Design a binder for these strands. Structure first.
Ligand code: MG
Ligand code: MG
Ligand code: MG
Ligand code: MG
Ligand code: MG
Ligand code: MG
Ligand code: MG
Ligand code: MG
Ligand code: MG
Ligand code: MG
Ligand code: MG
Ligand code: MG
Ligand code: MG
Ligand code: MG
Ligand code: MG
Ligand code: MG
Ligand code: MG
Ligand code: MG
Ligand code: MG
Ligand code: MG
Ligand code: MG
Ligand code: MG
Ligand code: MG
Ligand code: MG
Ligand code: MG
Ligand code: MG
Ligand code: MG
Ligand code: MG
Ligand code: MG
Ligand code: MG
Ligand code: MG
Ligand code: MG
Ligand code: MG
Ligand code: MG
Ligand code: MG
Ligand code: MG
Ligand code: MG
Ligand code: MG
Ligand code: MG
Ligand code: MG
Ligand code: MG
Ligand code: MG
Ligand code: MG
Ligand code: MG
Ligand code: MG
Ligand code: MG
Ligand code: MG
Ligand code: MG
Ligand code: MG
Ligand code: MG
Ligand code: MG
Ligand code: ZN
Lengths: 114, 100, 151, 99, 127, 224, 211, 83
RNA sequence: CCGCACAAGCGGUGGAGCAUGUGGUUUAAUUCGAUGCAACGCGAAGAACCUUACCUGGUCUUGACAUCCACGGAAGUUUUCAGAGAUGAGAAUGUGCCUUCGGGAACCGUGAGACAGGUGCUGCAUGGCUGUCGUCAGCUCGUGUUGUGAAAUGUUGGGUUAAGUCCCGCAACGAGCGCAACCCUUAUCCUUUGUUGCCAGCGGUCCGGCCGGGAACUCAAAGGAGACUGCCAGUGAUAAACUGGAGGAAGGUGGGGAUGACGUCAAGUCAUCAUGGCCCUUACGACCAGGGCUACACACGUGCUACAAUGGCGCAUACAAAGAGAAGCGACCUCGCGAGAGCAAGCGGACCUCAUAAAGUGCGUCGUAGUCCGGAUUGGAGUCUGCAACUCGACUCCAUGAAGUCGGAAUCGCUAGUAAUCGUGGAUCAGAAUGCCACGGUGAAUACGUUCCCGG
């Protein structure tokens, strides 16, 4: 199976296989399956290619895969170009939502550099 | 605490219970469902026009006979230290050292 | 336990079968005070062990347990200002508890993508005198009587 | 129709005395009475730091116990409801009446 | 005709009414098998009957409130024991040998100031 | 008491020749079977002259303290004191019983307070465990001062059995000037006894003879 | 080692409260502030009248202050005038009809508060502290107290190293909750600082609870 | 976010003075202390000196910064690195 | 000789992410205090403004807060302009209350000095309060006695106890402060009263204790009973006590709490308060807006969530206790995927609301993988509180899916309804809990022993 999302979903159940697309979570996958009339626990096998098409045109109703990555990239550059506080924090690689930086801000900084 | 802090507290209490009705009606207009947009907008401006110290959220509970701003108890109106002092002297009715 | 050496508490007999030692077993592998889960795992494992054994669950469990019960173990002692690694013979309830603990630990570290399954697997293994629990009992005995000097 | 009286106190001997007096005047004045039938005692609790600075761990716990009593008279003859209001009792007892 | 017994565990309270005639057991308008979804509770609630060997001669009507499943099971066991004792008064010795008149006083210990639990002390460091 | 009266009771008996005290030589008849034999020829007149003094003291309203701490003879000495309405010490002697009189008076008062309190009441107010504990303390105080609760003040005369065993009592008495009447076995030091009776102090029969004769003469001195 | 307040630990066992009114959670703090102001005013205006205790009850819509004093005449004043003069201002402070009752302490040397304030008054008139201590203890023991402890602390005699000196006479069992121990403190403001006086007075164990 | 029920927030004095400036033509930068005011579209092309605790930083209002608050474009802390 | 001190055990911390405190560095400021155990989720039971003590700038000088004196005004209420705001400049009313009718009391403003004011220094001047050894069993005194005397004895010795607990011995005898007990709570029963709580037998039912009715039971809260080594056996000086047994709901101070001796550390707190001395007075005082206390190369401490199958997810379905509520808790109903919104009942509350407990159980699914584990981070879109969520709130939806696969040396807690695990509530609080303080559910393992470690 190759969805409009150029990746290749797994062989697992459909409701979780559709979450392999960058932009589809659990709720979006459930909504896609309900819009395509497909059960959630059906594997990616035993689905006629017509069903793969009637779910590809459904997932096409969301900005997922590459287009979403571009949207995230341009929205971050918006802040990095305006000069706002969030922009400077995105530039310096520091928590942008008001978390403490005295300790344990590692996921925005990486391993400790002594 | 300093006398100026208690003075600020009593002035805030007075300003908050002087403008209570006007603030109440302005906030009602603002949060009013299906209110006219112009009426809601002018009410926001009028609300921010009133004295800042008239909002009850700017009052800080202080111990009523020392003015301490921490360790306050609403049931007694006193900080923990003065609550303990009046409790051990038997000046708080019913209050006694508990164990269970 | 410095002044009065305190005795042991009395577990009441197992609900389903009636073995106080099975009650000690289900208490031993119980995690986070979750009794019912360990109880179900034990009951399921014993039934699976019984089908291959063709023997009553209590007896096959008993023969597997005695196959793991050690009789001597090492002890760190100080008598003459030395780190005495003395081999000493074990008490009955102590060797019962050690056998149960060892088989629970070996089961937990086997995995087998289940709990009752792996527990029954290694109980049937320790029944035929083979497995890590039996391996660890033999290793304890070896460590004990490799230093027979202090007897 | 009836008269329901709730008594609140901080000490239980005082409330027992008050409810005994109330029920006794009610029984004397011809009314029919229900007994004290104590409602659950509310014990409010506070814990305060006994140390002004540094020692948060050092602290003591206080509690106020408020005791409830409920007296119900089903035949409030005007011979009785007046004498009820005329009756005055100890200071530390709250009395609440309802018809 | 009826014989009553009250039993208590950690925070539970069970009223037990015994009468002769069958082996019916009702608990809070529900059968025993559909009120206690645990075999441990099922066997601990009928230990006194199996001990005194009166399992199918007594109809039990139970009402239990408070506590958890194990607490309610233990309270019902204590109540059945007391009701059995009011029924015959000569079963007392065997029931006491089994320890069903124990009424264990164990209760959840209170939390204390400075500790994280009844006895769990917070972690401590020196260096 | 006549020499024959003593001899049948065995007053002549004494301790071993291995264990004697030097000043007792005048009072010792001799030795037999390595046993010291006390001479009744000295014993009888000295006992009679002591009985004269005891009768005199009791006939001037004297308070008499019978003293003996032998586990065998405690009850004998207690009953001896009761038979003449006097005061006794039968339990182990307490140092400062006479010299530290004030402390004994506080203990006497505490014993009186506990017995008076039990009769008056308030034991119901006390917890059942507390009331039982108070009764145990009252029993302990009685086992300690049963004889001297009613002595009131320092006694006027002392009667001592086995003066060597009770040496603290005689030292106190001499320090107070209170006279000492004592049955003195051969192993004792007779310096502390102003009216000394040399005789056996262990044998129940001779001890009871001493006590009965003394008590008869004390009642006689009281009767007038 | 710190000691629990001997009065507060016996509240409801052998000792009663100094305020005995009832109030919900909306007029509780107001009542505490009101009777704190009342007690403050009464201690200020009656510092010479040897006031021992100020009990305050609040009936339905009134306030009743009982003043336990040792010199009732000074509190009342001639013709029964000063008592009314302070009653009206107590009614002003409390904002409610007021009543003033006066209970005489027949033996002042057995009251902890009176002994303590006497000691402090002697202290700030530069009397040697041990003299006042001993005199207070002996006066209390003479009038039938079964025990008394007096402790004066803080820069005694005007030194530079503060120290604490106490003196006990009799039996003062502090761990016995059944014991009736009157305890009070006071402070003397000498030219070298504040000096703290504490007095414990044991008056015999009470059998039968608060009754 | 404030709410969609209410409107975006702005300080009254700032509103009046920016409307005066936009009707009277471009002028010197408008000095303000209202870091908490939302930038409205009628303020584009202006230059506002927003306080930052000690000095008024001049921010030239662009089209893209509409909807944000003024305080977002005048940092208050100084870091410059730990060296 | 004792103590979770070790041992025997179980679960952690140390590794990861995050929360929080501290050090450090940075900064206009990152306010001050706490610093081995006994500082480091500490003062703070809750920093967006306020709080707030710090910083920048704008301002005031008898002052923000108190008394006094003089002069002029009723008080207050509704507006306009300028200003970021403090503050400045602007109108009609009011003319109340009391009068020997002057005026006063209330309040306002101005003027003049005494003064106010200080979270400024010293906790090595103090009170008060607290920590700590340590709930460790000790600390002493009177009298007596011994010795010229300093002193000793008591308090040592033999046993025993949780204990200077108790019994013998003994020149000691007693007592005081401690120990214990008195207090609270919990485990059984009895008595009394039965509502808003209860429902055994009764009748009536819409199958709902719901309604007649019942006072039995659960329960509620007052009173009382009960446990004393009392009884039996054995050991032991016939003592103290110990070991076992009977009865009993409970047995050996039943479980827990409160209660902390003389003193120790010039221990902590002059920033709760009080206070000696010193210091400031158009400022170290006072008002205002914005900022900071939330920084970030790092180090340490206490926590939370994890790494999964004894689990995750979906559906179904059981069983709590203890609390809070009037500017409050807020049902039902409708709207929204949701946080919530609209309407609005009841409840100062055994009644109404918060409020369906979650682990559990049943059924199905996932099949050991960085996964249907984990949830960080980040983007977008929202709700609510509040003048105001940029710095810097919580929560929701959609998307995103870091590290982490059980953690070196070392180290911590715990002896039973305990550890562990699971949820619930409360204080502070407009809003803001992984902290703190409480509540119940499920519910262990082990203790041979005192040789070692630490402390006494
Ligand atoms: Mg999501
Ligand atoms: Mg934050
Ligand atoms: Mg001040
Ligand atoms: Mg606030
Ligand atoms: Mg309530
Ligand atoms: Mg304390
Ligand atoms: Mg957002
Ligand atoms: Mg481990
Ligand atoms: Mg680290
Ligand atoms: Mg870590
Ligand atoms: Mg720093
Ligand atoms: Mg700091
Ligand atoms: Mg802590
Ligand atoms: Mg300035
Ligand atoms: Mg002026
Ligand atoms: Mg000054
Ligand atoms: Mg000063
Ligand atoms: Mg100090
Ligand atoms: Mg102890
Ligand atoms: Mg010590
Ligand atoms: Mg000792
Ligand atoms: Mg000593
Ligand atoms: Mg000595
Ligand atoms: Mg000894
Ligand atoms: Mg003692
Ligand atoms: Mg001794
Ligand atoms: Mg005690
Ligand atoms: Mg109860
Ligand atoms: Mg009814
Ligand atoms: Mg009761
Ligand atoms: Mg007992
Ligand atoms: Mg038994
Ligand atoms: Mg027994
Ligand atoms: Mg206990
Ligand atoms: Mg300290
Ligand atoms: Mg400010
Ligand atoms: Mg954890
Ligand atoms: Mg969890
Ligand atoms: Mg709340
Ligand atoms: Mg509901
Ligand atoms: Mg809906
Ligand atoms: Mg709502
Ligand atoms: Mg809630
Ligand atoms: Mg489940
Ligand atoms: Mg997940
Ligand atoms: Mg993933
Ligand atoms: Mg322990
Ligand atoms: Mg929890
Ligand atoms: Mg919580
Ligand atoms: Mg718990
Ligand atoms: Mg040592
Ligand atoms: Zn002899």
């Amino acid at each position: 199976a190759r969805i409009a999302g150029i990746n290749i979903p797994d062989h697992k159940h459909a409701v979780i296989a559709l979450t392999s697309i960058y932009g589809v979570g659990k709720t979006r996958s459930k909504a896609i399956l309900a819009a395509a009339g497909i059960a959630e626990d059906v594997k990616i096998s035993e689905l006629s290619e017509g069903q793969i098409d009637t779910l590809r045109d459904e997932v096409a109703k969301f900005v997922v895969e590459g287009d979403l990555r571009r949207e995230i990239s341009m929205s971050i550059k918006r802040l990095m170009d305006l000069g706002c506080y969030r922009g400077l924090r995105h530039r310096r690689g520091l928590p942008v939502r008001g978390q403490r930086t005295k300790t344990n801000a590692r996921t925005r900084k990486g391993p400790r550099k002594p | 605490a300093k006398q100026s802090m208690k003075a600020r507290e009593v002035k805030r209490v007075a300003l908050a219970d002087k403008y209570f009705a006007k603030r109440a009606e302005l906030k009602a207009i603002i949060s009013d469902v299906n209110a006219s947009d112009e009426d809601r907008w002018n009410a926001v401006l009028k609300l921010q026009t009133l004295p800042r110290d008239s909002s009850p959220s700017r009052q800080r509970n202080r111990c009523r006979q020392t003015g301490r701003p921490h360790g306050f108890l609403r049931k007694f109106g006193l900080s923990r230290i003065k609550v303990r002092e009046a409790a051990m002297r038997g000046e708080i009715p019913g209050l006694k050292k508990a164990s269970w | 336990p410095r002044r009065r050496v305190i005795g042991q508490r009395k577990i009441l007999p197992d609900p389903k079968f009636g073995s106080e030692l099975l009650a000690k077993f289900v208490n031993i592998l119980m995690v986070d005070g979750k009794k019912s889960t360990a109880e179900s795992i034990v009951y399921s494992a014993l039934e699976t062990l019984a089908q291959r054994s063709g023997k009553s669950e209590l007896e096959a469990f008993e023969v597997a347990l005695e196959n793991v019960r050690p009789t001597v173990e090492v002890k760190s002692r100080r008598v003459g200002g030395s780190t005495y690694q003395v081999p000493v013979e074990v008490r009955p309830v102590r060797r019962n508890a050690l056998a149960m603990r060892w088989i629970v630990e070996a089961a937990r570290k086997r995995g087998d993508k289940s709990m009752a399954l792996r527990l029954a697997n290694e109980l049937s293994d320790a029944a035929e005198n083979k497995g890590t629990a039996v391996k660890k009992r033999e290793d304890v005995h070896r460590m004990a009587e490799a230093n027979k000097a202090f007897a | 129709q009836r008269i329901r009286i709730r008594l609140k106190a901080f000490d239980h001997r005082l409330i027992d005395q008050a409810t005994a007096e109330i029920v006794e005047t009610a029984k004397r004045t011809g009314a029919q009475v229900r007994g004290p039938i104590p409602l659950p005692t509310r014990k409010e609790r506070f814990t305060v730091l006994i140390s002004p600075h540094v020692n948060k761990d050092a602290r003591d716990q206080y509690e106020i116990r408020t005791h409830l009593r409920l007296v119900d008279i089903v035949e409030p003859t005007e011979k009785t409801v007046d004498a009820l209001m005329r009756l005055d009792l100890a200071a530390g007892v709250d009395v609440q009446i309802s018809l | 005709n009826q014989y009553y017994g009250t039993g208590r565990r950690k925070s539970s309270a069970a009223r037990v009414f015994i009468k002769p005639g069958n082996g019916k057991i009702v608990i809070n308008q529900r059968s025993l098998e559909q009120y206690f979804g645990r075999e441990t509770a099922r066997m601990v609630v009928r230990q006194p009957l199996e001990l005194v060997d009166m399992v199918e001669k007594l109809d039990l009507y139970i009402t239990v409130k408070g506590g958890g499943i194990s607490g309610q099971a233990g309270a019902i066991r204590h109540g059945i024991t007391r009701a059995l004792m009011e029924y015959d008064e000569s079963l007392r010795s065997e029931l006491r040998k089994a320890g069903f008149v124990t009424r264990d006083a164990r209760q959840v210990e209170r939390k204390k100031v400075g500790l994280r639990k009844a006895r769990r002390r917070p972690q401590f460091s020196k260096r | 008491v006549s020499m024959r009266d003593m001899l049948k009771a065995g007053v002549h008996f004494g301790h071993q020749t291995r264990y004697w005290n030097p000043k007792m030589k005048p009072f010792i008849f001799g030795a037999r079977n390595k046993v010291h034999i006390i001479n009744l020829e000295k014993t009888v007149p000295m006992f009679n002259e002591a009985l004269a003094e005891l009768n005199k003291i009791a006939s001037r309203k004297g308070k008499i303290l019978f003293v003996g701490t032998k586990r065998a003879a405690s009850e004998a000495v207690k009953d001896a004191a009761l038979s003449c309405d006097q005061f006794f010490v039968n339990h182990r002697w307490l140092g400062g019983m006479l010299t530290n009189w004030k402390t004994v008076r506080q203990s006497i008062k505490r014993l009186k307070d506990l017995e008076t309190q039990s009769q008056d009441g308030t034991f119901d107010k006390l917890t059942k465990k507390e009331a039982l504990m108070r009764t145990r303390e009252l029993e302990k105080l009685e086992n300690s001062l049963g004889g001297i609760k009613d002595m009131g003040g320092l006694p006027d005369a002392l009667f001592v059995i086995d003066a060597d065993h009770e040496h603290i009592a005689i030292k106190e008495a001499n320090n107070l000037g209170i006279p000492v009447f004592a049955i003195v076995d051969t192993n004792s030091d007779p310096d502390g006894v102003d009216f000394v009776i040399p005789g056996n102090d262990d044998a129940i029969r001779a001890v009871t003879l001493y006590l009965g004769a003394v008590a008869a003469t004390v009642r006689e001195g009281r009767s007038q | 080692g710190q000691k629990v307040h001997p009065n507060g630990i016996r509240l409801g066992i052998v000792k009663p409260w100094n305020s005995t009114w009832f109030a919900n959670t909306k007029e509780f703090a107001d009542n505490l502030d009101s009777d704190f102001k009342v007690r403050q005013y009464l201690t200020k205006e009656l510092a010479k009248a040897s006031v021992s205790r100020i009990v305050i009850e609040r009936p339905a819509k009134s306030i009743r202050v009982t003043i336990h004093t040792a010199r009732p005449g000074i509190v009342i004043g001639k013709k029964g005038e000063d008592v009314e003069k302070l009653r009206k201002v107590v009614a002003d402070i409390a904002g409610v009809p007021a009543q003033i009752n006066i209970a005489e302490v027949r033996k002042p040397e057995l009251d902890a508060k009176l002994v303590a304030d006497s000691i402090t008054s002697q202290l700030e008139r530069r009397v040697m502290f041990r003299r006042a201590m001993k005199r207070a203890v002996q006066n209390a023991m003479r009038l039938g107290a079964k025990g008394i402890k007096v402790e004066v602390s803080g820069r005694l005699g005007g030194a530079e190293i503060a120290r604490t000196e106490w003196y006990r006479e009799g039996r003062v069992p502090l761990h016995t909750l059944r014991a009736d121990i009157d305890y009070n403190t006071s402070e003397a403001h000498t030219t070298y600082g504040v000096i703290g006086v504490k007095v414990w007075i044991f008056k015999g164990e009470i059998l039968g609870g608060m009754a | 976010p404030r709410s969609l029920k209410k409107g975006p927030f702005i300080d009254l004095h700032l509103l009046k003075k920016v409307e005066k400036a936009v009707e009277s033509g471009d002028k010197k930068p408008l000095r303000t202390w209202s870091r908490r005011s939302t930038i409205f579209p009628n303020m584009i092309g202006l230059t506002i000196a927003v306080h930052n605790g000690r000095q008024h930083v001049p921010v030239f209002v662009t089209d893209e910064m509409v909807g944000h608050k003024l305080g977002e474009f005048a940092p208050t802390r100084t870091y410059r690195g730990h060296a």
